[PDB]
Design an enzyme around this catalytic site. Sequence first.
Site, PDB file in Angstrom:
ATOM      1  N   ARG B  37       0.920  -0.899  -0.209  1.00 27.12           N
ATOM      2  CA  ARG B  37      -0.195   0.274   0.121  1.00 27.12           C
ATOM      3  C   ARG B  37       1.033   1.371  -0.089  1.00 27.12           C
ATOM      4  NH1 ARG B  37       0.257  -3.558   4.188  1.00 27.12           N
ATOM      5  NH2 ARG B  37       1.608  -4.170   2.418  1.00 27.12           N
ATOM      6  N   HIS B 122       8.273 -12.497  17.607  1.00 27.50           N
ATOM      7  CA  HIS B 122       9.427 -12.056  16.897  1.00 27.50           C
ATOM      8  C   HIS B 122      10.458 -12.764  17.151  1.00 27.50           C
ATOM      9  CE1 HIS B 122       7.622  -7.836  16.006  1.00 27.50           C
ATOM     10  NE2 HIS B 122       9.027  -7.667  15.117  1.00 27.50           N
ATOM     11  N   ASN B 125      11.274 -14.911  19.992  1.00 30.84           N
ATOM     12  CA  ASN B 125      10.253 -15.138  20.827  1.00 30.84           C
ATOM     13  C   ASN B 125      10.556 -16.629  20.029  1.00 30.84           C
ATOM     14  OD1 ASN B 125       8.395 -13.795  22.564  1.00 30.84           O
ATOM     15  ND2 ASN B 125       7.866 -12.860  20.092  1.00 30.84           N
ATOM     16  N   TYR B 126      10.344 -16.254  18.391  1.00 27.59           N
ATOM     17  CA  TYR B 126      10.482 -18.283  17.994  1.00 27.59           C
ATOM     18  C   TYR B 126      11.849 -18.548  18.529  1.00 27.59           C
ATOM     19  CZ  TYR B 126       8.548 -15.218  14.635  1.00 27.59           C
ATOM     20  OH  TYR B 126       7.566 -14.012  13.795  1.00 27.59           O
ATOM     21  N   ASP B 152      15.189 -14.546  12.537  1.00 31.02           N
ATOM     22  CA  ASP B 152      15.228 -13.988  11.289  1.00 31.02           C
ATOM     23  C   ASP B 152      15.378 -14.212   9.639  1.00 31.02           C
ATOM     24  OD1 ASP B 152      14.180 -11.039  13.182  1.00 31.02           O
ATOM     25  OD2 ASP B 152      12.410 -12.572  12.476  1.00 31.02           O
TER      26      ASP B 152
END
Lengths: 353, 353
Positions: B37, B122, B125-126, B152
């Site tokens: 967008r 994030h 966390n993972y 990540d």
Amino acid sequence: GGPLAGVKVIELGGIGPGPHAGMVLADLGADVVRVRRPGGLTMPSEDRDLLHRGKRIVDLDVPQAMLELAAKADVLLDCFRPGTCERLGIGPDDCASVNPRLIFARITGWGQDGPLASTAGHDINYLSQTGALAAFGYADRPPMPPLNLVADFGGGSMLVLLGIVVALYERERSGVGQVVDAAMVDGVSVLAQMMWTMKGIGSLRDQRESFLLDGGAPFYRCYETSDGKYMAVGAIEPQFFAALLSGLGLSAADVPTQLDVAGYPQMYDIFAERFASRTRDEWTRVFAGTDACVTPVLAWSEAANNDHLKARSTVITAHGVQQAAPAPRFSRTPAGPVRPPPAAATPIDEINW
Amino acid sequence: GGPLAGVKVIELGGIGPGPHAGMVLADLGADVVRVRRPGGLTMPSEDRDLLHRGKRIVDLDVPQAMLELAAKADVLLDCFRPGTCERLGIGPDDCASVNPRLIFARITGWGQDGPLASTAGHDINYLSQTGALAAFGYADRPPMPPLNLVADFGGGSMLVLLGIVVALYERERSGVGQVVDAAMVDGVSVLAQMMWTMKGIGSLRDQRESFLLDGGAPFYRCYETSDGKYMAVGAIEPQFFAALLSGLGLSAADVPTQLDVAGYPQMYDIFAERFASRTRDEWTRVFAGTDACVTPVLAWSEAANNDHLKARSTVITAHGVQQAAPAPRFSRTPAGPVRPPPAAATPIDEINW
């Protein structure tokens, strides 16, 4: 049986990145075959090394009779120091003569060219040159390496893996293979791009525990619980920071604002305070299911029995011991069930190629 | 122009793994096109985000007129929460209809299926669920995440990258693409295989700083120097441990033996002592060129000007600021020079597909 089914792979060196790449290749259906001297002093016994599952060991001291093997293979995974591989019969040039369809992959910490190329080193070292290591850990204590996940695998194994599957798609159109130079120092530097982005933009400072992702932000780090365990918080987005403050039983007006960096030291105390007044279990319950980005730091033993990791069957117990299921996951050509490491070396004439 | 030249890629979500994967794809020659967008609140400005270099931004609020775009593309890199992508016009099913040659890649921290799948989180966390995080850092202080390199990128970006190039090689024979599920919790667990191997073998203990690669071994960690800097040591092999002890000006008989684990605490003191009696510079000179596996921990700034990284041109200064050169390196179809991030969004009818 796997999207990479039919791919002939020759694994040479036997340490860290080399073999770990080999594994994934096998996990994805490739016909991986390790080539090593019999007197191998490997630890642990290959038949107990999850990094070898689905592969086939083959005694073969390097006697250059292997050039005859490569010619039938698609990929040759060199894992020896630069030069050593071509010091012997094998080598990018020689193999080219016997098979121009060959993909000569090479995983190194320093890479082929360069001054350090000859120097010996490990994960912690390669990370020292990229600047990634110097950005790790607490300010006072020296930098502490994340085991060997960043360079050896995250930017080593995965790099050569990427290069291989890429060199495959290439030759799978150019009908001609080539040499792939996977340098760990290179991979790590690419894994750090986001940082470089920051570095140019001016979002980084000189000291540690100052950035957003290095512990410099109380809403993105770990807090000890009552029962000596730990909880991992990553409430970055303001919406998630809300949840964090909510389940933590804190009013927005009580704790400083995400924007109030100057008051972070205080926010840390407020967070530390509350987090240490309960057990990991209780806490896990509270923030459970909420977008608070608060999870319990699980240990290896604990992780293998984790509800989520079990449902998706990430850590499965395959004939023998606990391990990690193949990845990533494909919808039409998934990875077959995990086979065990080579129980015993397979001859050599019983190949297939 | 890159081994992946000719590949049509559509990048959707704009955070961490998603865009970092997109970057590599572009770095390797792929025709990557971001779709987002216009009111984007991205930070920093896309035209200054190294993760977008060589890509093309395209305004397009999701108006399902994009299904018309996918049909011409080879890959669709979904980076939104699970479901959201199919909650709109786009989705594995819908795209299949318009183009069965499409590779529907999906990078997620929790993956598609599973209880946590809907939950937000994030990198830190993972890592908490896989058990890799609980194995990081010093024993006393809580675990500290290695920035966001492990999940990540190391086990996120690279995972979906592998999945894609693999899904490409697949369809490049089966003439049919499919869906690729890249779960960070999955990649990280695979990055940790070595650990699992150890876990079953009994080489791991319960407390931190006890293993070989977590600081539990003085010959594999960092030591502070006189000038407050740091040196990274990784003398694992006995031969290298020799060098370490040599340049360090210590007699084998002086320091305990690698095997004398019980005397490690002592070995640590002897190592800390000597290392802190000189400057990183001097030390770098001493262990320079030797297989001692002793290197200087360089900072981002310092790394960019490092001799080795410069020679191999790992960290280069491309039109504008410092960044990481493409990787891995190919011998016949290398990566072209790095282009800059999109200076301005390109129309949409000026595509190419």
